[PDB]
Amino acid sequence: EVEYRAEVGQNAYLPCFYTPAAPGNLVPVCWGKGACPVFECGNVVLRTDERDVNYWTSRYWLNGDFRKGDVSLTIENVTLADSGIYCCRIQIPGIMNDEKFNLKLVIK
């Protein structure tokens, strides 16, 4: 629900945080467009593993210290087409433990 906003042509910011079991004990994260599906992300835009980011493109990057578990996302230069629900998924290990965050971007 909580609308996140940006004007066309701005960078957008979407917050997503998780807590590492311990510093430099990282958990796979993914952002996609569309709400979180059953597994991982729909239309991945960015994917990390335990070590680092392993998938991305130019428009999407992690703007923060993801090694401390700030996996908030920036989107380069938004068009109206970038409007919608973005999934941020923390693939916490163990049974059915995923943390799923849907964040609604709205582009004036």
Partner: antibody, heavy 123, light 108 residues
Framework: EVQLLESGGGLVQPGGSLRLSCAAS????????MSWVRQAPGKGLEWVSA????????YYKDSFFGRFTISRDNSKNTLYLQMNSLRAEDTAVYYC????????????????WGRGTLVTVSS | DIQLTQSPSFLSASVGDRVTITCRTS??????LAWYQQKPGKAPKLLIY???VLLSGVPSRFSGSGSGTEFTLTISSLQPEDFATYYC?????????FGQGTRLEIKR
């Protein structure tokens, strides 16, 4: 050729245990969600279990809570299901499956299946 | 669990026919639906996923549409080899669930 080859299927008494294996070839195993999906003879498709690429995240349908454990050995390119407390109605063909072509849009859409291995729960 | 109800359960149709199979979901499933085609003694073959997207290899005479709670698989120009039980599958919420299946036999 992306290939999944289950084995371990066979006859097992109710209450009994069975480990299924799935051998994966022809792709980078350790970067793909793996699922088990099952099908009683003549009947429909039931998703059982999934596991993350890394093999540290596990997923289950409620019916398998506590009974079934999914694991992978990425170095052996092999997927496992440990099935405990098996029941007659667990009698089915067990497929492993992955999202390969699909992964970049919708994981869990299974473009790649195995042959199936039949598990029979009977006295 | 999200229930998927397919209709019809059974369909008999002549080569060249246009046939649609509907799948209704008990909750909003977004676009997170897949269509599979299972021939006897074989594993399901994925035809369509994300509602509308054809797997490479799949004849363009297969098509999907819909979103939310109602989804359609359409086979135009039905062929004999299109005999199969067809399943929808939702990928919106755990557990993954399928429809009961639609069996399509070829009138002849």
């Amino acid at each position: 050729e992306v290939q999944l080859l289950e084995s371990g299927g066979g006859l097992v008494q109710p209450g009994g245990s069975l480990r299924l294996s799935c051998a994966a070839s022809g792709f980078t195993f350790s970067s793909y969600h793996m699922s088990w999906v099952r099908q009683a003879p003549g009947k429909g498709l039931e998703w059982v279990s999934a596991i993350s690429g890394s093999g540290r995240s596990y997923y289950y349908k409620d019916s398998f809570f506590g009974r079934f454990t999914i694991s992978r050995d990425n170095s052996k390119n092999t997927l496992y299901l440990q099935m405990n407390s098996l029941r007659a109605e667990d009698t089915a063909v067990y497929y492993c499956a992955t999202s390969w072509e699909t992964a970049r849009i919708l994981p869990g859409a299974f473009d790649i299946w195995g042959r199936g291995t039949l598990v029979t729960v009977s006295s | 669990d999200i229930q998927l109800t397919q209709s019809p359960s059974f369909l008999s149709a002549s080569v060249g026919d246009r046939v649609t199979i509907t799948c209704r979901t008990s909750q909003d499933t977004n676009s997170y639906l897949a269509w599979y085609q299972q021939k006897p003694g074989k594993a399901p073959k994925l035809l369509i996923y994300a509602a509308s997207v054809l797997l490479s290899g799949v004849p363009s005479r297969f098509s999907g549409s819909g979103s939310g709670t109602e989804f359609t698989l359409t086979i135009s120009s039905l062929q004999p080899e299109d005999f199969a039980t067809y399943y929808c599958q939702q990928l919106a919420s755990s557990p993954i669930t399928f429809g009961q299946g639609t069996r399509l036999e070829i009138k002849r």
